[PDB]
Amino acid sequence: MASPTVITLNDGREIQAVDTPKYDEESGFYEFKQLDGKQTRINKDQVRTVKDLLE
């Protein structure tokens, strides 16, 4: 499934994903696919708010 989701970090840095993120218990990161179609991962504590563009 694909849906636009903007993840806002602790400092306020917002990144927009084309599909929904995965919380990985193994490494402790959140995995999300950026607008470019590139998957990136950031630590569980850096994420402030997880919201869709469809609010």
For the chain, the structural domain boundaries read 1-55
The candidate with the shortest Cα–Cα distance to 10, out of 41, 40, 44, is: 44
In Å, how far are 18, 49, 55 from 45, measured between CA atoms? 22, 11, 23
Buried b (16+ CB within 10 A) or exposed e, 23-45: eeeeeebbebbeeeeeeeebeee
Token pair belonging to 36: 């470019």
Method: NMR
Is 1-55 CATH 2.30.30.100? yes
